[PDB]
Amino acid sequence: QPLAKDKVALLIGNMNYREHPKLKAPLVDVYELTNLLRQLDFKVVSLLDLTEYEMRNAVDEFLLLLDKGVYGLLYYAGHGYENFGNSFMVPVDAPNPYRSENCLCVQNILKLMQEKETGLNVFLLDMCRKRNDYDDTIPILDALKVTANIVFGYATCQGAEAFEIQHSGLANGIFMKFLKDRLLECHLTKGKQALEIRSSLSEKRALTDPIQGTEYSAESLVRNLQWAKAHELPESMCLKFDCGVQIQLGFAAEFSNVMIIYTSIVYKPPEIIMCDAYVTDFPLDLDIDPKDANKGTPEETGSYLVSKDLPKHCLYTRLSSLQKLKEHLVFTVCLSYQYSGLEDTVEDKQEVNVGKPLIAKLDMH
Amino acid sequence: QPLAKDKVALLIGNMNYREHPKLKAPLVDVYELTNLLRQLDFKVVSLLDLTEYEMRNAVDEFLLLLDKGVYGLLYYAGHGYENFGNSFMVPVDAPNPYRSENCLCVQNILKLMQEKETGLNVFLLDMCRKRNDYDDTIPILDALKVTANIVFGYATCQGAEAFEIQHSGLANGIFMKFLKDRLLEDKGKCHLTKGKQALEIRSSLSEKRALTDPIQGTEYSAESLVRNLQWAKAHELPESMCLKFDCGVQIQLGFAAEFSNVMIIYTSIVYKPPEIIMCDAYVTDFPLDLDIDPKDANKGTPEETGSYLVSKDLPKHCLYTRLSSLQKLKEHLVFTVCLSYQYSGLEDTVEDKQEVNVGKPLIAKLDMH
Ligand SMILES: CC1(C)CN(C(=O)Nc2cnc(-n3nccn3)c(Cl)c2)c2cnc3cc(Cl)nn3c21
Ligand SMILES: CC1(C)CN(C(=O)Nc2cnc(-n3nccn3)c(Cl)c2)c2cnc3cc(Cl)nn3c21
Ligand SMILES: [Ca+2]
Ligand SMILES: [Ca+2]
Ligand SMILES: [Ca+2]
Ligand SMILES: [Ca+2]
Ligand SMILES: [Ca+2]
Ligand SMILES: [Ca+2]
Ligand SMILES: [Ca+2]
Ligand SMILES: [Ca+2]
Ligand SMILES: [Ca+2]
Ligand SMILES: [Ca+2]
Ligand SMILES: [Ca+2]
């Protein structure tokens, strides 16, 4: 029987490039792939918009989980490049033009995966190439794609336009389709595209293979808790203001580095006729435009989470970039309230601290 | 809207290697893709077990159909190999070891397709590579300079065992799945198995193209005429016939096209007069061109002949004979239908025989020898 010792996954989606065309596609594709992998018993990390430093720390810690018998999946979506056989994943902080030292190399990660003694390695790259970056003419000089169980997947589109066109739609990502078709148990648009799948398997492996489950393992507890504690969300607060008004502050995870906050009035005393609550004062590291806070749908914040997913009728705020948090997520719930019978509006302020939510816990900036 | 000026396809499936491990997979995959393409309004040729001479003629004549705006699909399944940046399709007569002179080069065919003013080229290869071909040459190339309106697809498995395993099942061809998902506008099952495997799909499209795009039936009337005629001249199947034997017994003799180079023949008694108590009929005397063992003729299912066709597809209650290799027919398909009959009241089994000529069925009508 093929068994997994563990099932671990790291998904990266880069979009918000400083010096390169911004992408949109990754967000959806990471979310849907996360959601698939959860149902296959994977512990997933899902990170949007990483710098070089962030990507390296993330990938290394993924690689540290790949012991003997582990099933490991790595996914990247975003800009990439190719030179002399060597492919590169570009972080959001990379300058223009691309230099190798600003980028993470595919083949290095692949070589590291092949040393680890895993039961299955999966490495899936969905890359936007620059228009005129075709594959180079090369000899093959070095390989490990025999000695360990590998599925390697490499999609390309030439240019951001063709990339975004082919990725348009929900539920439709190339690798999610591949996984569903090939590893359990969207029309061809204009432009230039490529897909490469390569595999070397000594025996049939599938994502659906059972974990060798444990009753009393220290290692398995370690593994579980290392991941689970990187995914602590704040408990919902019922914030009581001095006038008697109660604002519920709720929290949702969207990615390992994205939290939705949402606000609702849950008590209005008879002495108050009208009230509004809003959030402000977020840490500058997280970099929120208040134009994208306090919105009347989660959709308006840029969330994948829709109005049917979250509690309804709130104001919604998306706090992305949690990996950049230095201290605590200190922010302010404000209350505006009008007293019953008066025109007079009062303001009040309640500072909230929620600690280090999600990957912010690691404190690795 | 994109239009095709025509839809033409050539499918080759090579299995019966003389000097190389035999394959089984191609039969099914060619049949099922042929069926799909038929339903999309392609004129299809489907050929099993071609020599180099046969492959070259077929491919060349396929390339002749690729006029302006035509949609052309070439599919190959069987052995391939790689050498110094080139890739090769191996014909069934290929010497061991593989030498380029004996094989058809993928890169040639790809550039021959890209030279045409077609509206869409599709070129799909689904190959076995022998393990020995992994270790002998340093790789360079396999990608290609995929340009024009082209969809290049290229799949490999290392070794016949892994190849056959990955292809086990009906309905489960990688390229059929691909075309259905990616190239039809609409206007589990293939589990990844052991071994070393590769897939490469490349597309270049100046505008959206699909296999479902309607045929523009205007312009280029003589080219259209010739395409249609040439194809249809390669697909004349003989009509079903009733042979009346002089004793009164009626043998039905039916025909089915399995590939452009494979015909099923089937026989049944459709009338026994009351004077005959028992009878049986069989076929014999096929031309030596077609090779066929008489122990593999006269079977009680089409499954027993080696066909894709199951007992659902043809008339039940017959004997079935499969004639492959029709492209090698140098003359007419002449055979004998035999009858054995016992009269009521007699111990005597009488024999009778009738000769049949059905001409040159299917691709044999091209007369290429
Ligand atoms: C939870 C762990 C063990 C940790 N990890 C990370 O990605 N760590 C990470 C570390 N530092 C930064 N950083 N931010 C700022 C600067 N450095 C970042 Cl972004 C991430 C992954 C990654 N993949 C999987 C999979 C499974 Cl299971 N656990 N797991 C983990
Ligand atoms: C019917 C035509 C026009 C012809 N053709 C062939 O394959 N010709 C062919 C010629 N010679 C041999 N041979 N046998 C013995 C020796 N030489 C063989 Cl096997 C085949 C194809 C091939 N593809 C498509 C597609 C559409 Cl439409 N027509 N079409 C045609
Ligand atoms: Ca390049
Ligand atoms: Ca290298
Ligand atoms: Ca650096
Ligand atoms: Ca998508
Ligand atoms: Ca700190
Ligand atoms: Ca006031
Ligand atoms: Ca012509
Ligand atoms: Ca020759
Ligand atoms: Ca070779
Ligand atoms: Ca099959
Ligand atoms: Ca007698």
PDB file of N, CA and C in Angstrom, chain A residues 135-141 145-146 151 156 166 174 177-205, chain B residues 138-143 146-147 151 156 166 174 177-178 181-186 188-209:
ATOM      1  N   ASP A 135      11.490  29.036 -24.334  1.00  0.00           N
ATOM      2  CA  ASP A 135      12.520  28.129 -23.794  1.00  0.00           C
ATOM      3  C   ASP A 135      13.839  28.278 -24.540  1.00  0.00           C
ATOM      4  N   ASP A 136      14.938  28.054 -23.828  1.00  0.00           N
ATOM      5  CA  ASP A 136      16.254  28.176 -24.464  1.00  0.00           C
ATOM      6  C   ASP A 136      16.703  26.840 -25.003  1.00  0.00           C
ATOM      7  N   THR A 137      17.618  26.900 -25.963  1.00  0.00           N
ATOM      8  CA  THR A 137      18.258  25.702 -26.460  1.00  0.00           C
ATOM      9  C   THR A 137      19.400  25.348 -25.510  1.00  0.00           C
ATOM     10  N   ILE A 138      19.375  24.111 -25.027  1.00  0.00           N
ATOM     11  CA  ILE A 138      20.229  23.650 -23.934  1.00  0.00           C
ATOM     12  C   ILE A 138      20.632  22.204 -24.182  1.00  0.00           C
ATOM     13  N   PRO A 139      21.770  21.736 -23.663  1.00  0.00           N
ATOM     14  CA  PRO A 139      21.950  20.327 -23.336  1.00  0.00           C
ATOM     15  C   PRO A 139      21.360  20.084 -21.943  1.00  0.00           C
ATOM     16  N   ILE A 140      20.927  18.862 -21.661  1.00  0.00           N
ATOM     17  CA  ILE A 140      20.692  18.501 -20.258  1.00  0.00           C
ATOM     18  C   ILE A 140      22.038  18.082 -19.673  1.00  0.00           C
ATOM     19  N   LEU A 141      22.337  18.604 -18.487  1.00  0.00           N
ATOM     20  CA  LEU A 141      23.636  18.372 -17.850  1.00  0.00           C
ATOM     21  C   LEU A 141      23.513  17.745 -16.460  1.00  0.00           C
ATOM     22  N   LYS A 145      15.520  13.344 -11.652  1.00  0.00           N
ATOM     23  CA  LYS A 145      14.118  12.985 -11.905  1.00  0.00           C
ATOM     24  C   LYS A 145      13.981  11.496 -12.230  1.00  0.00           C
ATOM     25  N   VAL A 146      14.493  10.687 -11.311  1.00  0.00           N
ATOM     26  CA  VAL A 146      14.452   9.234 -11.368  1.00  0.00           C
ATOM     27  C   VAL A 146      14.427   8.664  -9.953  1.00  0.00           C
ATOM     28  N   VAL A 151       6.172  14.396  -9.343  1.00  0.00           N
ATOM     29  CA  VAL A 151       5.320  14.937 -10.391  1.00  0.00           C
ATOM     30  C   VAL A 151       5.694  16.400 -10.495  1.00  0.00           C
ATOM     31  N   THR A 156       2.898  27.705 -18.773  1.00  0.00           N
ATOM     32  CA  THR A 156       3.355  29.028 -19.185  1.00  0.00           C
ATOM     33  C   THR A 156       2.316  29.702 -20.074  1.00  0.00           C
ATOM     34  N   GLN A 166      -6.391  33.338 -20.150  1.00  0.00           N
ATOM     35  CA  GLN A 166      -6.528  31.899 -19.928  1.00  0.00           C
ATOM     36  C   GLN A 166      -6.939  31.523 -18.511  1.00  0.00           C
ATOM     37  N   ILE A 174      -5.637  25.007 -14.327  1.00  0.00           N
ATOM     38  CA  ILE A 174      -5.013  23.880 -15.025  1.00  0.00           C
ATOM     39  C   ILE A 174      -4.556  22.755 -14.109  1.00  0.00           C
ATOM     40  N   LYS A 177      -7.473  20.937 -12.298  1.00  0.00           N
ATOM     41  CA  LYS A 177      -7.978  19.954 -13.245  1.00  0.00           C
ATOM     42  C   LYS A 177      -7.070  18.733 -13.358  1.00  0.00           C
ATOM     43  N   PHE A 178      -5.766  18.976 -13.494  1.00  0.00           N
ATOM     44  CA  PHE A 178      -4.770  17.897 -13.500  1.00  0.00           C
ATOM     45  C   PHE A 178      -4.822  17.019 -12.259  1.00  0.00           C
ATOM     46  N   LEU A 179      -4.851  17.652 -11.091  1.00  0.00           N
ATOM     47  CA  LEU A 179      -4.929  16.910  -9.841  1.00  0.00           C
ATOM     48  C   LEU A 179      -6.174  16.054  -9.765  1.00  0.00           C
ATOM     49  N   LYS A 180      -7.328  16.674 -10.017  1.00  0.00           N
ATOM     50  CA  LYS A 180      -8.595  15.939 -10.064  1.00  0.00           C
ATOM     51  C   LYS A 180      -8.632  14.778 -11.046  1.00  0.00           C
ATOM     52  N   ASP A 181      -8.085  14.992 -12.246  1.00  0.00           N
ATOM     53  CA  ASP A 181      -8.075  13.945 -13.275  1.00  0.00           C
ATOM     54  C   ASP A 181      -7.058  12.847 -12.996  1.00  0.00           C
ATOM     55  N   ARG A 182      -5.859  13.227 -12.560  1.00  0.00           N
ATOM     56  CA  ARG A 182      -4.715  12.321 -12.662  1.00  0.00           C
ATOM     57  C   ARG A 182      -4.277  11.767 -11.320  1.00  0.00           C
ATOM     58  N   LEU A 183      -4.557  12.480 -10.230  1.00  0.00           N
ATOM     59  CA  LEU A 183      -3.911  12.186  -8.947  1.00  0.00           C
ATOM     60  C   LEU A 183      -4.881  11.884  -7.825  1.00  0.00           C
ATOM     61  N   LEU A 184      -6.162  11.795  -8.140  1.00  0.00           N
ATOM     62  CA  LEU A 184      -7.152  11.283  -7.203  1.00  0.00           C
ATOM     63  C   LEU A 184      -7.479   9.864  -7.632  1.00  0.00           C
ATOM     64  N   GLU A 185      -7.580   8.977  -6.648  1.00  0.00           N
ATOM     65  CA  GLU A 185      -8.002   7.586  -6.799  1.00  0.00           C
ATOM     66  C   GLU A 185      -6.846   6.685  -7.195  1.00  0.00           C
ATOM     67  N   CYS A 186     -12.501  24.786 -19.631  1.00  0.00           N
ATOM     68  CA  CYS A 186     -11.632  25.949 -19.875  1.00  0.00           C
ATOM     69  C   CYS A 186     -11.070  25.868 -21.282  1.00  0.00           C
ATOM     70  N   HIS A 187     -11.618  26.657 -22.196  1.00  0.00           N
ATOM     71  CA  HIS A 187     -11.193  26.585 -23.594  1.00  0.00           C
ATOM     72  C   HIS A 187      -9.787  27.125 -23.795  1.00  0.00           C
ATOM     73  N   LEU A 188      -9.184  26.732 -24.904  1.00  0.00           N
ATOM     74  CA  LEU A 188      -7.857  27.192 -25.272  1.00  0.00           C
ATOM     75  C   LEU A 188      -7.994  28.578 -25.885  1.00  0.00           C
ATOM     76  N   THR A 189      -7.465  29.570 -25.188  1.00  0.00           N
ATOM     77  CA  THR A 189      -7.585  30.964 -25.613  1.00  0.00           C
ATOM     78  C   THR A 189      -6.432  31.353 -26.540  1.00  0.00           C
ATOM     79  N   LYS A 190      -6.564  32.531 -27.156  1.00  0.00           N
ATOM     80  CA  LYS A 190      -5.517  33.048 -28.035  1.00  0.00           C
ATOM     81  C   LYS A 190      -4.197  33.334 -27.319  1.00  0.00           C
ATOM     82  N   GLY A 191      -3.135  33.327 -28.108  1.00  0.00           N
ATOM     83  CA  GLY A 191      -1.804  33.598 -27.600  1.00  0.00           C
ATOM     84  C   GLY A 191      -0.917  32.383 -27.695  1.00  0.00           C
ATOM     85  N   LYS A 192       0.229  32.480 -27.040  1.00  0.00           N
ATOM     86  CA  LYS A 192       1.153  31.362 -26.927  1.00  0.00           C
ATOM     87  C   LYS A 192       1.077  30.785 -25.517  1.00  0.00           C
ATOM     88  N   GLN A 193       0.908  29.471 -25.437  1.00  0.00           N
ATOM     89  CA  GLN A 193       0.876  28.741 -24.173  1.00  0.00           C
ATOM     90  C   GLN A 193       1.685  27.476 -24.266  1.00  0.00           C
ATOM     91  N   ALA A 194       2.095  27.001 -23.096  1.00  0.00           N
ATOM     92  CA  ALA A 194       2.694  25.689 -22.959  1.00  0.00           C
ATOM     93  C   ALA A 194       2.303  25.065 -21.639  1.00  0.00           C
ATOM     94  N   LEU A 195       2.264  23.743 -21.638  1.00  0.00           N
ATOM     95  CA  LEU A 195       2.171  22.926 -20.441  1.00  0.00           C
ATOM     96  C   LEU A 195       3.195  21.821 -20.566  1.00  0.00           C
ATOM     97  N   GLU A 196       3.923  21.572 -19.488  1.00  0.00           N
ATOM     98  CA  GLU A 196       4.744  20.377 -19.364  1.00  0.00           C
ATOM     99  C   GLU A 196       4.401  19.658 -18.069  1.00  0.00           C
ATOM    100  N   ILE A 197       4.111  18.364 -18.156  1.00  0.00           N
ATOM    101  CA  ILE A 197       4.018  17.509 -16.976  1.00  0.00           C
ATOM    102  C   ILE A 197       5.127  16.485 -17.125  1.00  0.00           C
ATOM    103  N   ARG A 198       5.928  16.283 -16.089  1.00  0.00           N
ATOM    104  CA  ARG A 198       6.881  15.174 -16.062  1.00  0.00           C
ATOM    105  C   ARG A 198       6.701  14.416 -14.761  1.00  0.00           C
ATOM    106  N   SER A 199       6.760  13.096 -14.827  1.00  0.00           N
ATOM    107  CA  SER A 199       6.636  12.262 -13.640  1.00  0.00           C
ATOM    108  C   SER A 199       7.594  11.093 -13.654  1.00  0.00           C
ATOM    109  N   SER A 200       8.040  10.730 -12.462  1.00  0.00           N
ATOM    110  CA  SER A 200       8.824   9.546 -12.239  1.00  0.00           C
ATOM    111  C   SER A 200       8.292   8.955 -10.966  1.00  0.00           C
ATOM    112  N   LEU A 201       7.657   7.801 -11.084  1.00  0.00           N
ATOM    113  CA  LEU A 201       7.026   7.143  -9.959  1.00  0.00           C
ATOM    114  C   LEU A 201       7.472   5.694  -9.954  1.00  0.00           C
ATOM    115  N   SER A 202       8.003   5.212  -8.836  1.00  0.00           N
ATOM    116  CA  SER A 202       8.323   3.780  -8.729  1.00  0.00           C
ATOM    117  C   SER A 202       7.094   2.890  -8.561  1.00  0.00           C
ATOM    118  N   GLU A 203       6.042   3.460  -7.993  1.00  0.00           N
ATOM    119  CA  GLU A 203       4.760   2.808  -7.787  1.00  0.00           C
ATOM    120  C   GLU A 203       3.700   3.883  -7.887  1.00  0.00           C
ATOM    121  N   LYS A 204       2.454   3.470  -8.098  1.00  0.00           N
ATOM    122  CA  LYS A 204       1.339   4.413  -8.135  1.00  0.00           C
ATOM    123  C   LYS A 204       1.232   5.190  -6.833  1.00  0.00           C
ATOM    124  N   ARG A 205       1.270   6.505  -6.962  1.00  0.00           N
ATOM    125  CA  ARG A 205       1.013   7.416  -5.863  1.00  0.00           C
ATOM    126  C   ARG A 205      -0.143   8.285  -6.305  1.00  0.00           C
TER     127      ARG A 205
ATOM    128  N   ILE B 138      22.531  12.453 -25.242  1.00  0.00           N
ATOM    129  CA  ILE B 138      22.208  13.627 -24.430  1.00  0.00           C
ATOM    130  C   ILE B 138      21.033  14.369 -25.077  1.00  0.00           C
ATOM    131  N   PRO B 139      19.949  14.679 -24.349  1.00  0.00           N
ATOM    132  CA  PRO B 139      18.846  15.444 -24.922  1.00  0.00           C
ATOM    133  C   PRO B 139      19.204  16.902 -25.172  1.00  0.00           C
ATOM    134  N   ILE B 140      18.534  17.465 -26.174  1.00  0.00           N
ATOM    135  CA  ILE B 140      18.615  18.896 -26.478  1.00  0.00           C
ATOM    136  C   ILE B 140      17.216  19.492 -26.607  1.00  0.00           C
ATOM    137  N   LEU B 141      16.399  18.838 -27.432  1.00  0.00           N
ATOM    138  CA  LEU B 141      15.193  19.452 -27.985  1.00  0.00           C
ATOM    139  C   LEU B 141      14.092  18.414 -28.139  1.00  0.00           C
ATOM    140  N   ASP B 142      12.877  18.943 -28.085  1.00  0.00           N
ATOM    141  CA  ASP B 142      11.594  18.235 -28.048  1.00  0.00           C
ATOM    142  C   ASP B 142      10.458  19.266 -28.059  1.00  0.00           C
ATOM    143  N   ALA B 143      10.770  20.477 -27.597  1.00  0.00           N
ATOM    144  CA  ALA B 143       9.856  21.613 -27.532  1.00  0.00           C
ATOM    145  C   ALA B 143       9.283  22.075 -28.862  1.00  0.00           C
ATOM    146  N   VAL B 146       6.956  26.254 -32.125  1.00  0.00           N
ATOM    147  CA  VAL B 146       5.516  26.135 -32.334  1.00  0.00           C
ATOM    148  C   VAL B 146       4.902  27.493 -32.689  1.00  0.00           C
ATOM    149  N   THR B 147       4.591  27.670 -33.968  1.00  0.00           N
ATOM    150  CA  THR B 147       4.188  28.954 -34.545  1.00  0.00           C
ATOM    151  C   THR B 147       3.137  28.728 -35.629  1.00  0.00           C
ATOM    152  N   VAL B 151      -1.516  23.556 -32.454  1.00  0.00           N
ATOM    153  CA  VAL B 151      -1.559  22.877 -31.172  1.00  0.00           C
ATOM    154  C   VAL B 151      -0.663  21.659 -31.315  1.00  0.00           C
ATOM    155  N   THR B 156       4.949  10.898 -23.728  1.00  0.00           N
ATOM    156  CA  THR B 156       5.809   9.713 -23.686  1.00  0.00           C
ATOM    157  C   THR B 156       5.648   8.931 -22.381  1.00  0.00           C
ATOM    158  N   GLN B 166      -0.518   2.726 -18.417  1.00  0.00           N
ATOM    159  CA  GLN B 166      -1.093   4.071 -18.434  1.00  0.00           C
ATOM    160  C   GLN B 166      -2.263   4.220 -19.400  1.00  0.00           C
ATOM    161  N   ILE B 174      -5.361  10.661 -23.227  1.00  0.00           N
ATOM    162  CA  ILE B 174      -4.951  11.984 -22.782  1.00  0.00           C
ATOM    163  C   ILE B 174      -5.331  13.087 -23.756  1.00  0.00           C
ATOM    164  N   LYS B 177      -9.203  13.473 -24.058  1.00  0.00           N
ATOM    165  CA  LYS B 177      -9.570  14.303 -22.911  1.00  0.00           C
ATOM    166  C   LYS B 177      -9.217  15.778 -23.100  1.00  0.00           C
ATOM    167  N   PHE B 178      -7.984  16.041 -23.531  1.00  0.00           N
ATOM    168  CA  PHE B 178      -7.539  17.396 -23.857  1.00  0.00           C
ATOM    169  C   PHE B 178      -8.415  18.108 -24.876  1.00  0.00           C
ATOM    170  N   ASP B 181     -11.809  18.923 -23.518  1.00  0.00           N
ATOM    171  CA  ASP B 181     -11.796  20.002 -22.521  1.00  0.00           C
ATOM    172  C   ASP B 181     -11.449  21.362 -23.112  1.00  0.00           C
ATOM    173  N   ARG B 182     -10.476  21.382 -24.020  1.00  0.00           N
ATOM    174  CA  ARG B 182      -9.816  22.632 -24.395  1.00  0.00           C
ATOM    175  C   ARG B 182     -10.210  23.124 -25.777  1.00  0.00           C
ATOM    176  N   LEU B 183     -10.730  22.250 -26.629  1.00  0.00           N
ATOM    177  CA  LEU B 183     -10.830  22.541 -28.061  1.00  0.00           C
ATOM    178  C   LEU B 183     -12.213  22.289 -28.634  1.00  0.00           C
ATOM    179  N   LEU B 184     -13.166  21.978 -27.772  1.00  0.00           N
ATOM    180  CA  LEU B 184     -14.572  21.891 -28.125  1.00  0.00           C
ATOM    181  C   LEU B 184     -15.224  23.098 -27.475  1.00  0.00           C
ATOM    182  N   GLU B 185     -15.966  23.899 -28.243  1.00  0.00           N
ATOM    183  CA  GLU B 185     -16.714  24.993 -27.608  1.00  0.00           C
ATOM    184  C   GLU B 185     -18.011  24.526 -26.964  1.00  0.00           C
ATOM    185  N   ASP B 186     -18.413  23.295 -27.272  1.00  0.00           N
ATOM    186  CA  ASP B 186     -19.662  22.716 -26.768  1.00  0.00           C
ATOM    187  C   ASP B 186     -20.873  23.213 -27.554  1.00  0.00           C
ATOM    188  N   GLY B 188      -9.113  10.260 -11.447  1.00  0.00           N
ATOM    189  CA  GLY B 188     -10.157   9.304 -11.850  1.00  0.00           C
ATOM    190  C   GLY B 188     -10.206   9.079 -13.351  1.00  0.00           C
ATOM    191  N   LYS B 189     -10.197   7.811 -13.760  1.00  0.00           N
ATOM    192  CA  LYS B 189     -10.371   7.363 -15.147  1.00  0.00           C
ATOM    193  C   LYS B 189      -9.093   7.311 -15.965  1.00  0.00           C
ATOM    194  N   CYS B 190      -8.254   8.320 -15.793  1.00  0.00           N
ATOM    195  CA  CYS B 190      -6.886   8.260 -16.285  1.00  0.00           C
ATOM    196  C   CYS B 190      -6.006   8.630 -15.123  1.00  0.00           C
ATOM    197  N   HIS B 191      -5.868   7.670 -14.225  1.00  0.00           N
ATOM    198  CA  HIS B 191      -5.006   7.796 -13.066  1.00  0.00           C
ATOM    199  C   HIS B 191      -3.562   7.735 -13.558  1.00  0.00           C
ATOM    200  N   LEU B 192      -2.698   8.558 -12.981  1.00  0.00           N
ATOM    201  CA  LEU B 192      -1.274   8.514 -13.292  1.00  0.00           C
ATOM    202  C   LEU B 192      -0.662   7.253 -12.692  1.00  0.00           C
ATOM    203  N   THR B 193       0.023   6.492 -13.526  1.00  0.00           N
ATOM    204  CA  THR B 193       0.590   5.206 -13.135  1.00  0.00           C
ATOM    205  C   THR B 193       2.108   5.282 -13.073  1.00  0.00           C
ATOM    206  N   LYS B 194       2.699   4.168 -12.642  1.00  0.00           N
ATOM    207  CA  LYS B 194       4.133   4.098 -12.405  1.00  0.00           C
ATOM    208  C   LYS B 194       4.965   4.279 -13.672  1.00  0.00           C
ATOM    209  N   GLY B 195       6.248   4.507 -13.458  1.00  0.00           N
ATOM    210  CA  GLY B 195       7.179   4.663 -14.552  1.00  0.00           C
ATOM    211  C   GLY B 195       7.589   6.102 -14.719  1.00  0.00           C
ATOM    212  N   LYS B 196       8.372   6.328 -15.762  1.00  0.00           N
ATOM    213  CA  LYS B 196       8.797   7.665 -16.133  1.00  0.00           C
ATOM    214  C   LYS B 196       7.959   8.132 -17.318  1.00  0.00           C
ATOM    215  N   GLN B 197       7.342   9.291 -17.159  1.00  0.00           N
ATOM    216  CA  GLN B 197       6.359   9.812 -18.098  1.00  0.00           C
ATOM    217  C   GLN B 197       6.591  11.283 -18.340  1.00  0.00           C
ATOM    218  N   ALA B 198       6.164  11.726 -19.512  1.00  0.00           N
ATOM    219  CA  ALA B 198       6.209  13.130 -19.886  1.00  0.00           C
ATOM    220  C   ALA B 198       5.027  13.486 -20.762  1.00  0.00           C
ATOM    221  N   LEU B 199       4.560  14.709 -20.596  1.00  0.00           N
ATOM    222  CA  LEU B 199       3.566  15.322 -21.452  1.00  0.00           C
ATOM    223  C   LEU B 199       4.031  16.726 -21.738  1.00  0.00           C
ATOM    224  N   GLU B 200       3.861  17.135 -22.984  1.00  0.00           N
ATOM    225  CA  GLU B 200       4.154  18.473 -23.443  1.00  0.00           C
ATOM    226  C   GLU B 200       3.015  18.895 -24.350  1.00  0.00           C
ATOM    227  N   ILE B 201       2.371  20.002 -24.024  1.00  0.00           N
ATOM    228  CA  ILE B 201       1.369  20.600 -24.897  1.00  0.00           C
ATOM    229  C   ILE B 201       1.818  22.027 -25.144  1.00  0.00           C
ATOM    230  N   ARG B 202       1.821  22.448 -26.402  1.00  0.00           N
ATOM    231  CA  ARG B 202       2.179  23.804 -26.788  1.00  0.00           C
ATOM    232  C   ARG B 202       1.120  24.310 -27.734  1.00  0.00           C
ATOM    233  N   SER B 203       0.742  25.568 -27.579  1.00  0.00           N
ATOM    234  CA  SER B 203      -0.217  26.197 -28.475  1.00  0.00           C
ATOM    235  C   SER B 203       0.268  27.563 -28.905  1.00  0.00           C
ATOM    236  N   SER B 204      -0.012  27.898 -30.155  1.00  0.00           N
ATOM    237  CA  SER B 204       0.114  29.245 -30.646  1.00  0.00           C
ATOM    238  C   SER B 204      -1.138  29.488 -31.442  1.00  0.00           C
ATOM    239  N   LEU B 205      -1.913  30.497 -31.067  1.00  0.00           N
ATOM    240  CA  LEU B 205      -3.159  30.822 -31.750  1.00  0.00           C
ATOM    241  C   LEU B 205      -3.236  32.328 -31.889  1.00  0.00           C
ATOM    242  N   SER B 206      -3.397  32.843 -33.106  1.00  0.00           N
ATOM    243  CA  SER B 206      -3.607  34.293 -33.272  1.00  0.00           C
ATOM    244  C   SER B 206      -5.014  34.765 -32.898  1.00  0.00           C
ATOM    245  N   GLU B 207      -5.953  33.835 -32.884  1.00  0.00           N
ATOM    246  CA  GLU B 207      -7.333  34.029 -32.469  1.00  0.00           C
ATOM    247  C   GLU B 207      -7.797  32.687 -31.938  1.00  0.00           C
ATOM    248  N   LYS B 208      -8.848  32.691 -31.125  1.00  0.00           N
ATOM    249  CA  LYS B 208      -9.458  31.445 -30.651  1.00  0.00           C
ATOM    250  C   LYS B 208      -9.855  30.513 -31.795  1.00  0.00           C
ATOM    251  N   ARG B 209      -9.495  29.247 -31.657  1.00  0.00           N
ATOM    252  CA  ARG B 209      -9.850  28.205 -32.613  1.00  0.00           C
ATOM    253  C   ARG B 209     -10.419  27.056 -31.806  1.00  0.00           C
TER     254      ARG B 209
END
